[model samples]
Target: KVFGRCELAAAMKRHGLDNYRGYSLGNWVCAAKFESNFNTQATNRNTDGSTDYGILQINSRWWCNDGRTPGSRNLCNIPCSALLSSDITASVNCAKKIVSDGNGMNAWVAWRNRCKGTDVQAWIRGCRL
Candidate 1:
């Protein structure tokens, strides 16, 4: 159940981290913690009955026609749960892609900075993402 740094680096690569120079492992970790408490299997049910599932809390229905179902595809061809399994690299990579393309990591970077004392939600809002 221990996630390693090398694995995280691989995940970053899969998410096109090389395309950007400022993304740090610490930043990714912070974002994940803030969003899903690092639970790869986390899921949130919206008031409308929709659900966001997996480590990055991807909207299950968006990727796949089904929400929270075994066959749902939240990241690429991989199932949402696969991204949240013990493979930390996979989980991180999946999240990176979603955030970079869907939500962007600006909010995550701001969150990291806010951890030092600035407002958490405020910094998140100021983020371009």
Candidate 2:
């Protein structure tokens, strides 16, 4: 996919991730870096029947449906494939929902474990668009 930071942030900005739910876009960037390295095509299978999808690694158990996972919650109402697309509209919207439900970005374990309390500007660095 894309390299890292700035342009990627701009890409996400183009899709409306600005200060989403009181969380900085850089925090989201940190989450994606750890979650799937910004690979929208990435997927990780959970020990449960569920899976994680896309750049934000949205979960199947709670956020999306892949048709193979029986009785998936698909809370985002997005097909899992949609989350895995280069077009990140569905993915960002769903991430917004996740942050809304959690009151922050802590729902993403990657963000919780690594990015909290850090300078989000470092994550954004020179990528200010």
Candidate 3:
């Protein structure tokens, strides 16, 4: 499922991503935009033998267990398949775990490169929160 920009913003807000760990909803929206283009089943294989899953593209290296990533920590204790579903509750929960892991919103390079050091309010401007 691919979400519209405003649609994703509203969903993230509903999941309490608004200003989560000091990163606004726009930050999450921006990350989702570049990482997965709001695709719920998006997957990206990385050179390090890790795969990113779901809308936020949560990684297998340290977050979810994909049974294929080498030496995965599975810190989120969730199966990677679960992240692919349209229901974003698990995805949002995992993202929150990532934020609280001392990295804040820097866990995703998409966020760091595209959302960071930029004004992301536009990502949520048209959405009625």
Tell me the alpha-carbon RMSD of every candidate: 7.8, 1.4, 0.9
The residue pairs that clash in candidate 1, if any, are 99-104
lDDT of 3 by residue, 24-103 (tens): 88899999999999999999999999999999999999999999987779888899999999899999999999999997
Rank order by TM-score, top first?
Answer: 3, 2, 1
Off by over 4 Å in 1: 1-21, 64-75, 106-129
Candidate 3 TM-score over all chains jointly: 0.96
Which segments of model 2 are wrong by more than 4 Å? none
RMSD over all Cα atoms, model 1: 7.8
Per-residue accuracy of model 2 over 68-97 as CA lDDT, tens digit each? 787768889989899888778899889888
Worst 10 residues of 3 by lDDT: 120-129
lDDT of each: 0.50, 0.83, 0.91
lDDT of 1 by residue, 1-129 (tens): 333334443454455653343554445544555656656667676555556555455555444233345444454555555655655555555555555574456434434443424332332232323
Candidate 1 residue 82 Cα shift, in angstroms, is: 1.6
